Ligand binder design. Structure first.
Ligand code: CLA
Ligand code: CLA
Ligand code: CLA
Ligand code: PHO
Ligand code: PL9
Ligand code: LMG
Ligand code: LMG
Ligand code: LHG
Ligand code: HEM
Ligand code: BCR
Ligand code: BCR
Ligand code: BCR
Ligand code: FE2
Lengths: 50, 35, 31, 32, 335, 24, 37, 75, 27, 258, 34, 50, 32, 301
């Protein structure tokens, strides 16, 4: 991504990331992690900090 | 007789220590001895 | 009063303070 | 006098002396 | 009174009793040699870095008074004209004139000699304290390594050279100058003894870090050892392949690595004192000379050493009065 | 020759490593 | 430079950026006052 | 006697309130007045090079070096 | 270099043999 | 050195611990401070010889760990337990053989050395753990065979015994932190308790099973043996606690309007 | 060269897949006593 | 140069912090944060031959 | 000159803004 | 994973192996073995490499008239720069070897191997039930390796500037690096030298003190040094042993990373001047003269 060569690409990527982050936010507010997610991660404050 | 005599003990770890030391010195100093 | 620790601390400190004063003085020296 | 206050004062004076030394490092002799 | 077999009290007994009292600072008999000598070495270095100049010895202005900072301040070695004169305040040069004695660079000799005797006194202090509480003086034996390094590089090396001028001056930038001087002239990196010394130093740092990390990580939960030797042994057997099964031998190895490294470094610097240096491989030199296309990192190192020598000798050796014209100074584009 | 003796010394060192880590 | 209205207030600005270092030192000195509980 | 007691006590501060500034001022006068240059032989910024010598000084004589340094310096 | 080769061979041989015979004496 | 042979009766079972089944005995290791820890006869490791079952008219007197655990957990009434702790009532939960072997290892570990004594104890512990795993597998097979014979008492006793000798501070190759048999046995006792009318203890054991890395939720969803346990709402409560719904349908329903 | 490229890509993909699936296999860190 | 240097230093430090905190989080989840249990250890249950 | 004096005054006021709070808490209230 | 009733998963995580493989080892062992094999092969025999695209074939192979000390794996050609140069991009294997591709192969595989080595250290810290920060300590040499092999090429824009995989090559890289960035005068490398010297110092002191104490400590060190020892408890002493070299090497690696992006060491050239403005020499500008020699002799052109 360090090879972006025009503001058009930067703003398009920012549109995409903003939309994706909004969708992920409403997804995470309305969802609980899947069993594989609950199994593959340590769920503690220091784990999230890590 | 020999009232005070003790056979030298050199366990396996000391053997490998000595062999490694000798071979390391050899690889280090061969490039200079050959010159 | 004039203990060994007293002598050591003073020998280390009095020259230290004098040298700190000298260094600070030469900080604002000409040129 | 509290010991912690003494330590704070000593540290502040030491920081001031260090700042003076660096200032001289940037102005005066040894500054080019 | 007090003694081996009803020995009358003498002055020596009183002096020994006073010198070995459990006060804040253990003075001991070796204290009489350590404290004056070490104190005067530190004071001489600090005074030289603060006030005394190097203008008349090295043609440099190296002190806080002249405008140098901590890094560039140093107690420069005497001029090469002084050769190996110890430069006493009462010597045939600077006959009692403290000002001129400082100008002659004799302050470096003061610091170096008083520091050598302070190191001797500190080793004797280690011996005395070890005997006081009845412990083996392995710390004194360990300190034999830094004493060997100091004697080799600050005393034996200049003694083998043309004078004190080429000793390492007591300063950060001056020590860097000494290091680059060895690189350029002696090819001290290529010396196998320096190689062994750097291997020992890096291995000692590795041992320090690894031992600390493992002892802190193999600690026991909540007279007895506080960490699991078996756990560390298993971890290193199954990670690296070799592990220490004995704490005694482990700590002795930690002692032995840096000491051996520094001692081999001292031997190498003794060799360099006589210019007995592993500078070049004659076979590679002749191969490069006969074959211009042939080139390796060793030949490049020799070229860099030549560059250092030729470009630095003009200012680093004023006594030689070398004036290299621009056309003869070695350059990369001139190869 | 010179390269072969260097390689022999290096492979001997590697063999010592292997024996030390495995042949306890 | 700063706008003219704030021109006399240059010196205070010159010490503003260093204040986070003063905050970490403040945490340390507060702990010292607490005596490192 | 211990560090905490001795530094906490006001006796230390009052006895050293007139000494530590005295030593600092002593150093300041030692430097500013130029006595450091005179006693330690450090040349002043305006006397590194003389009219006779316009390069870094060099001392050649080993024994007769006192006079050589006297000549090389301003004296 | 005949001298260097001989010296390297001797340095490899004699101390290795000394250590090995010591091990045979007491393992 | 006569045994106290005291008697203790309390409602349900709180503020108590248990020992391993390696010695085929049950001992109260400690009393939990969260509940009524007051106990004159159960203040230390007491080998409870007899434990009457409230449901059964007769008073059981077996010394097996599984028998006593079944009696104490199945009986919701006061019941009764005969603690046969000695006069000293010393902590002897780990009977083993003796400390002569461990003496060398302790002396060698205090000195920070590995050597051979630690190696000897390592080999002893390895063979002991292998034998323990083999015995647990054999007991599980026997319990399943009795299950095929429809003997809930014996199967439950065997499962409790299997869970008894769980290796303390276990660390599996795959970071299990629990023997593979542990979760299976916990789920099996959960279902057996559920179909034996002990709904509350069944839910507690199912929670223990889930805590010990049990992931076969779908099996729990469809299991007639656990059907009775599904009657209690605490079953769904613990299922939600350990298996939350992926998508909060109620949340989107609530936000569908305002 | 293309055959070597495909072989190396396959090897790297296989090893990375083994790594990821293996860490997904390891049981989650839990405290037996709490 | 200043941005690259400072942010590389900060990124390296924060990766080291990830290592530290992730190790500590796994230890806390598994109960190894305090240390090795003195009464018994995972090593003491393994075959002596490493 | 005057700007440097103002900068020094601001610096010392900043440097005291925190120690003032901690000493006030240590003396007044005692919470700290 | 899950191969033949999860037997492969059991074996990879099995601690009964003489050397614990682990899931991080699944990537370390192939990467490290590939790097080892390619390094051995290149050191023993490899055609000379144009370390710079001036078409000067520097030779670092033993068969090409080199010894162990001089032999090295030459950095990748400056023409390649930071471009990815595996075997399949070169027109032929001879061209790949002639441009120094083995150096990128070894460096990439070795960096992945050391990262997975930190990973294995964590894995066996967790498996054996101990506190996992040996990986954090090992991150220091790994950080320095990345700085000299990866970060410095990134900052300088070419893998030709990475440290050669050799001894004489290492010395040449160090001499060049001092020439171009004044490594000695940079405070981070100064801190790293302090870290290494103090690591050796504390290793020697700890070894001596523990050896003397093990008759079958605190008072001896207390009377020896006048400020006594703060780390009276052994746990604090061992943490200090871990921390000093580790953070020293962290900081020297970071210093090198900064110089990769052209942030050199302290430049005190002409720091002190005469009243008339004449430059007065110090040790700084003698170091500068040495650096000038190294710089001019480096630029073979
Ligand atoms: C920083 C922001 C952030 C964070 C911390 C999380 C955290 C989480 N998400 Mg959320 N998510 C986010 C942003 C975020 N998400 C966004 C923006 C979206 C919209 C696309 C989603 C959509 C989303 C869904 C749909 C789901 C999650 C899930 C999860 C959980 C499982 C772990 C995970 O994400 O996979 C860790 C990563 C992987 C498993 C593999 C990554 C695969 C990507 C596509 C590969 C791309 C590689 C790329 C080409 C090269 C990268 C180079 C360099 C960065 C290395 C975890 C709680 C899951 C969950 O538990 O449910 C709640 C789930 O089902 N997330
Ligand atoms: C007690 C610790 C101690 C030690 C070991 C040293 C050691 C040294 N100092 Mg230091 N010094 C010390 C304390 C010490 N000093 C103190 C307290 C001061 C402050 C006054 C100084 C001030 C000082 C200066 C200013 C200088 C030194 C110098 C020296 C060196 C040369 C000294 C020398 O050979 O003449 C002294 C040696 C002797 C007196 C020989 C001792 C042997 C016996 C006791 C004398 C003979 C007695 C005998 C019965 C009579 C014989 C008669 C005969 C002639 C017929 C040497 C490294 C000089 C040097 O090298 O610097 C570059 C230097 O310039 N020192
Ligand atoms: C642990 C295994 C491992 C890893 C991680 C690497 C990693 C690497 N190798 Mg090495 N290699 C290995 C084993 C490994 N190797 C073995 C066993 C051999 C002997 C056969 C080699 C022989 C070898 C050669 C001869 C060369 C490499 C090269 C490379 C690099 C190129 C990577 C690439 O193009 O794939 C890209 C792979 C991915 C991006 C992974 C994608 C995975 C996703 C998750 C799924 C798949 C998506 C899609 C289908 C692809 C990289 C540093 C080249 C090099 O020098 O570069 C420095 C090179 O020339 N390797
Ligand atoms: C540059 C690196 C370095 C320094 C600075 C250093 C310093 C020290 N190590 C000591 C100890 C040790 N060093 C040891 C192993 C090692 N030490 C090493 C490297 C070093 N050791 C290495 C590599 C090893 C491994 C072998 C051991 C085993 C010990 C100890 O027992 C001892 C200790 O307790 O550790 C804390 C102390 C000596 C006692 C004393 O105050 O001197 C007393 C004598 C004096 C002061 C006179 C000598 C004066 C010298 C000549 C310098 C004078 C000039 C200036 C003061 C310095 C100029 C500096 C410029 C160059 C920048 C001191 C803190
Ligand atoms: C073609 C090919 C192959 C190329 C060849 C490559 C080549 C070009 C170079 C190699 C040539 C070569 C070998 C040159 C180097 C030669 C050299 C100079 C050698 C130095 C020789 C020497 C005698 C020097 C004297 C100083 C000396 C003794 C140094 C020794 C260094 C040394 C071995 C350090 C220790 C290293 C190390 C990794 C230790 C780890 C040990 C370890 C696992 C302990 C951890 C641990 C900690 C605990 O706390 C506890 C409790 C336990 C239990 C425990 O375990
Ligand atoms: C008794 C113990 C004394 C300890 C002295 C330590 C060395 C400091 C001497 C004074 C000095 O150099 O500052 C003196 C210099 C003076 O700075 C210079 O002053 C000159 C005066 O004409 C000019 O103005 C120059 O332009 C100016 O740069 O101040 C600094 O460089 C500031 C940085 C100070 C760095 C302190 C050392 C940090 C690293 C070592 C830490 C361990 C040391 C203790 C170990 C035990
Ligand atoms: C290990 C133990 C460590 C203990 C440390 C003790 C330190 C004590 C203080 C050290 C200084 C005292 C020695 C001064 C020696 C001296 O000045 O010599 C200076 C004189 C030589 O002086 C030289 O002579 C030459 C003759 O052609 C030329 O005239 C030179 O110009 C002239 O400088 O040497 C001696 O006095 C005799 C040597 C005595 C032995 C000293 C050690 C030698 C070390 C090896 C040297 C080769 C390398
Ligand atoms: C006359 C013709 C013959 C002449 C032969 C002259 C040479 C003979 C001696 C040869 C050397 C023997 C050495 C034995 C070596 C040996 O067996 O040591 C063993 C010994 C430790 O002894 P222990 O405490 O194990 O003793 C237990 C007893 O039962 C036996 O020692 O080590 C030491 O005490 C000193 C340190 C040596 C070991 C460390 C060396 C440094 C590490 C190696 C460096 C290279 C590694 C790579 C670094 C990058
Ligand atoms: C010529 C200069 C000085 C003189 C004459 C002097 C005098 C004294 C006196 C009279 C005491 C009281 C000791 C007692 O009551 O037992 C003392 C103690 C002390 N002074 Fe100084 N002082 C000087 C310089 C300094 C300096 C510059 C410092 C610090 C930078 C300092 C730090 C101390 C300390 C730490 C003590 C405590 C010593 C102990 O408790 O044994 N002194 N000094
Ligand atoms: C704005 C921008 C853009 C774009 C952007 C984008 C497109 C982004 C994306 C992003 C993304 C897409 C990201 C991703 C990420 C991912 C990650 C980061 C992952 C991780 C993973 C992990 C970490 C894992 C782990 C694990 C596993 C493997 C399993 C087992 C367990 C564990 C946990 C270990 C453009 C260029 C246009 C423009 C400019 C900039
Ligand atoms: C904008 C503003 C301002 C301000 C602000 C702020 C935010 C401030 C802050 C401030 C602060 C926040 C401060 C702080 C300070 C601090 C200090 C001053 C500290 C010190 C410390 C010390 C001195 C220490 C020491 C030590 C330690 C570290 C511990 C241990 C011991 C010792 C002693 C070593 C002004 C007013 C200008 C104006 C208006 C508004
Ligand atoms: C008789 C004699 C002599 C002697 C002398 C002396 C003995 C001297 C001493 C001196 C001294 C004894 C000095 C001292 C000084 C000191 C100083 C100069 C210091 C400084 C310090 C500093 C700078 C610090 C800093 C810091 C910082 C800021 C960081 C944090 C912490 C600290 C605090 C570390 C003479 C040479 C004359 C002559 C000959 C003989
Ligand atoms: Fe230790």
């Amino acid at each position: 991504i360090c090879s972006v060569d025009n503001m058009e690409d930067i703003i398009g990527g920012h549109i995409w990331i903003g939309t994706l982050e909004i969708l992920g936010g409403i997804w995470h507010i309305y969802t609980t992690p899947w069993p594989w997610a609950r199994r593959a991660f340590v769920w503690s404050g220091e784990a999230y900090l890590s | 007789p020999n009232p005070n005599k003790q056979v030298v003990e050199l366990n396996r770890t000391s053997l490998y220590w000595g062999l490694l030391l000798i071979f390391v010195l050899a690889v280090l100093f061969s490039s200079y001895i050959f010159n | 009063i004039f203990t060994v620790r007293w002598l050591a601390i003073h020998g280390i400190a009095v020259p230290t303070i004098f040298f700190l004063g000298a260094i600070t003085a030469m900080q604002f020296i000409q040129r | 006098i509290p010991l912690w206050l003494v330590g704070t004062v000593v540290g502040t004076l030491a920081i001031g002396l260090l700042a003076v030394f660096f200032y001289g490092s940037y102005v005066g002799l040894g500054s080019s | 009174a007090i003694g081996t077999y009803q020995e009358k009290r003498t002055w020596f007994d009183d002096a020994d009793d006073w010198l070995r009292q459990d006060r804040f600072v253990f003075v001991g008999w070796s204290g009489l040699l350590l404290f004056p000598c070490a104190y005067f070495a530190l004071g001489g270095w600090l005074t030289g870095t603060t006030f005394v100049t190097s203008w008349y010895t090295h043609g440099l202005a190296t002190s806080y008074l002249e405008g140098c900072n901590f890094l560039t301040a140093a107690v420069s070695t005497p001029a090469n004209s002084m050769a190996h004169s110890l430069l006493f305040v009462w010597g045939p040069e600077a006959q009692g004139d403290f000002t001129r004695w400082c100008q002659l660079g004799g302050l470096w000799a003061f610091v170096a000699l008083h520091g050598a005797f302070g190191l001797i006194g500190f080793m004797l202090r280690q011996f005395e304290i070890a005997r006081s509480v009845n412990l083996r003086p392995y710390n004194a034996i360990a300190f034999s390594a830094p004493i060997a390094v100091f004697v080799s590089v600050f005393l034996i090396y200049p003694l083998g050279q043309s004078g004190w001028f080429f000793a390492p001056s007591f300063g950060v930038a001056a020590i860097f100058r000494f290091i680059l001087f060895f690189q350029g002239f002696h090819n001290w990196t290529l010396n196998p003894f320096h190689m062994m010394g750097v291997a020992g130093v890096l291995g000692a740092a590795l041992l320090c870090a690894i031992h600390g990390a493992t002892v802190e990580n193999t600690l026991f939960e909540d007279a007895e050892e506080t960490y699991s030797m078996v756990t560390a042994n298993r971890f290193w057997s199954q990670i690296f392949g070799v592990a220490f099964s004995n704490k005694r031998w482990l700590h002795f190895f930690m002692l032995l690595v840096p000491v051996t490294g520094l001692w081999m470094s001292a031997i190498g610097v003794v060799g360099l004192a006589l210019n007995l240096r592993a500078y070049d491989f004659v076979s590679q030199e002749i191969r490069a000379a006969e074959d211009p296309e042939f080139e390796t990192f060793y030949t490049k190192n020799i070229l860099l050493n030549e560059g250092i020598r030729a470009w630095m000798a003009a200012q680093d050796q004023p006594h030689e009065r070398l004036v290299f014209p621009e056309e003869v100074l070695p350059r990369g584009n001139a190869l | 020759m010179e390269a072969l003796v260097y390689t022999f010394l290096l492979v001997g060192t590697l063999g010592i490593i292997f024996f030390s880590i495995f042949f306890r | 430079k700063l706008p003219e209205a704030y021109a006399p207030f240059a010196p205070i600005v010159d010490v503003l950026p260093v204040i986070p270092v003063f905050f970490i030192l403040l945490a340390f000195v507060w702990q010292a006052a607490v005596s490192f509980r | 006697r211990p560090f905490s007691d001795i530094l906490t006590s006001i006796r230390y501060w009052v006895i050293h309130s007139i000494t530590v500034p005295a030593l600092f001022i002593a150093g300041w006068l030692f430097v500013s007045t130029g006595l450091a240059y005179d006693v330690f032989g450090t040349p002043r910024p305006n006397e590194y090079f003389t009219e006779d010598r316009q390069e870094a000084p060099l001392i050649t004589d080993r024994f007769n070096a006192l006079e050589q340094v006297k000549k090389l310096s301003g004296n | 270099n005949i001298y260097g080769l001989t010296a390297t061979a001797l340095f490899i041989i004699i101390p290795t043999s000394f250590l090995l015979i010591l091990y045979v004496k007491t393992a | 050195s006569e045994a106290e042979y005291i008697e203790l009766d309390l409602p349900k079972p709180l503020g108590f611990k248990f020992a391993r089944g390696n010695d085929g005995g049950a001992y109260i290791i400690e009393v939990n401070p969260k509940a009524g820890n007051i106990d004159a006869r159960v203040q230390p490791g007491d080998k409870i010889v007899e434990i009457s079952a409230s449901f059964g008219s007769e008073v059981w007197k077996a010394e097996n760990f599984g028998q006593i655990m079944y009696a104490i957990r199945t009986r919701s009434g006061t019941v009764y337990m005969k603690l046969k702790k000695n006069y000293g009532d010393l902590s002897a939960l780990e009977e083993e053989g003796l400390d002569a072997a461990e003496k060398q290892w302790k002396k060698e570990r205090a000195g920070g050395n590995y050597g051979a004594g630690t190696k000897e104890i390592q080999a002893r512990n390895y063979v002991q753990r292998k034998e323990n795993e083999r015995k647990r597998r054999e007991m599980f097979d026997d319990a399943l065979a009795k299950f095929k014979e429809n003997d809930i008492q014996g199967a439950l006793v065997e499962f409790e015994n299997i869970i008894a000798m769980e290796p303390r501070n276990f660390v599996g190759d795959n970071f299990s932190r629990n023997t593979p048999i542990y979760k299976v046995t916990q789920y099996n006792i959960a279902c057996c308790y559920s179909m034996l009318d002990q709904v509350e203890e069944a839910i507690k054991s199912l929670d223990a099973a889930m805590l010990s890395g049990f992931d076969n939720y779908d099996q729990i969803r469809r299991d007639k043996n656990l059907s009775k346990a599904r009657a209690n709402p605490k079953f769904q409560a613990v299922l939600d606690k350990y298996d939350e719904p992926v998508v909060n349908w109620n949340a989107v329903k609530a936000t569908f309007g305002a | 060269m293309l055959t070597l490229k495909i072989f190396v890509y396959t090897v790297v993909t296989f090893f990375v897949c083994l790594f990821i699936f293996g860490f997904l296999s390891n049981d989650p860190a839990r405290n037996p006593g709490k | 140069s200043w941005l690259a240097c400072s942010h590389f230093c900060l990124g390296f430090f924060f990766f080291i912090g990830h290592l530290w905190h992730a190790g500590r989080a796994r230890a806390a989840a598994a109960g190894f944060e305090k240390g090795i249990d003195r009464f018994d250890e995972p090593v003491l249950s393994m075959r002596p031959l490493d | 000159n005057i700007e440097l004096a103002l900068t020094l005054v601001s610096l010392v006021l900043v440097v005291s803004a925190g120690p003032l709070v901690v000493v006030l808490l240590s003396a007044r209230g005692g919470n700290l | 994973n899950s191969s033949l009733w999860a037997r492969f998963c059991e074996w990879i995580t099995s601690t009964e192996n003489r050397l614990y493989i682990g899931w991080f080892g699944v990537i370390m062992i192939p990467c490290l073995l590939t790097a080892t094999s390619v390094f051995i092969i290149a050191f023993i025999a490899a055609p000379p490499v144009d370390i710079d695209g001036i078409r000067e074939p520097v030779s670092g192979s033993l068969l090409y008239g080199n010894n162990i000390i001089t032999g090295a794996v030459i950095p990748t050609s400056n023409a390649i720069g930071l471009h990815f140069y595996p075997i399949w991009e070169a027109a032929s294997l001879d061209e790949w070897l002639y441009n120094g591709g083995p150096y990128q192969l070894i460096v990439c595989h070795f960096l992945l191997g050391v990262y997975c080595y930190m990973g294995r250290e964590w894995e066996l810290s967790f498996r054996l039930g101990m506190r996992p920060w040996i990986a954090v300590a090992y991150s220091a040499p790994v950080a320095a390796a990345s700085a000299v092999f990866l970060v410095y090429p990134i900052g300088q824009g070419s893998f030709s500037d990475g440290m050669p995989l050799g001894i004489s090559g290492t010395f040449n890289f160090m001499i060049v690096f001092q020439a171009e960035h004044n490594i000695l005068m940079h405070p981070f490398h100064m801190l790293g030298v302090a870290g290494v010297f103090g690591g050796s110092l504390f290793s020697a002191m700890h070894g001596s003190l523990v050896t003397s104490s093990l008759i079958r400590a605190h008072g001896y060190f207390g009377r020896l040094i006048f400020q006594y020892a703060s780390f009276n408890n052994s746990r604090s002493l061992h943490f200090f042993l871990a921390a000093w070299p580790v953070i020293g090497i962290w900081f020297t690696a970071l210093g090198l990373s900064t110089m990769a992006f052209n942030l050199n060491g302290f430049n005190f050239n002409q720091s002190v001047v005469d009243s008339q403005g004449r430059v007065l020499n110090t040790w700084a500008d003698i170091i500068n003269r040495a650096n000038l020699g190294m710089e001019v002799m480096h630029e073979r052109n």
